[PDB]
Amino acid sequence: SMEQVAMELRLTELTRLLRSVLDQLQDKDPARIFAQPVSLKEVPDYLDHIKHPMDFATMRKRLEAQGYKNLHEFEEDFDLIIDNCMKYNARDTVFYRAAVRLRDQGGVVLRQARREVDSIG
Numbered sequence: 001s002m003e004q005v006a007m008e009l010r011l012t013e014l015t016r017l018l019r020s021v022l023d024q025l026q027d028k029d030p031a032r033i034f035a036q037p038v039s040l041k042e043v044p045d046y047l048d049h050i051k052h053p054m055d056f057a058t059m060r061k062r063l064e065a066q067g068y069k070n071l072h073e074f075e076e077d078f079d080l081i082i083d084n085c086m087k088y089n090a091r092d093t094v095f096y097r098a099a100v101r102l103r104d105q106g107g108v109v110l111r112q113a114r115r116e117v118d119s120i121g
């Protein structure tokens with residue numbers, strides 16, 4: 001139907017917007033601390049601590065599969081990256097501090113993304 005095509009066009013455009021958001025968020029992680037899943041070879045107990053691991057590569061996979069139906073689902077995954085890190089790593093670590101900086105700087109990008117999604121529809 002035409003309605004399905006229109007829906008698919010909107011999702012493709014949402015995906016385009018979120019791709020831009022993801023690139024911007026990732027730029028705020030210059031150390032690439034969050035670029036890839038935490039290695040279970042290097043951190044074998046990681047899943048005892050963190051029940052829902054997340055990272056930017058995994059988000060990008062879902063993104064290109066058009067697996068984010070709305071901005072909320074995308075934000076949930078971004079929050080997992082930060083919140084997982086701030087639990088697994090102690091406050092006085094480069095990892096915890098990277099997550100805080102990513103959270104703070106990312107908030108700006110996400111704030112404008114929410115306005116754009118609402119506005120464009």
Ligand SMILES: CC(=O)N1CCN(c2ccccn2)CC1
Nearest residue numbers: 033038042043084085088089095
């Ligand atoms: C981002 C994050 O939470 N990580 C968990 C702690 N960590 C490592 C790396 C090697 C060995 C032990 N831990 C870095 C990744």
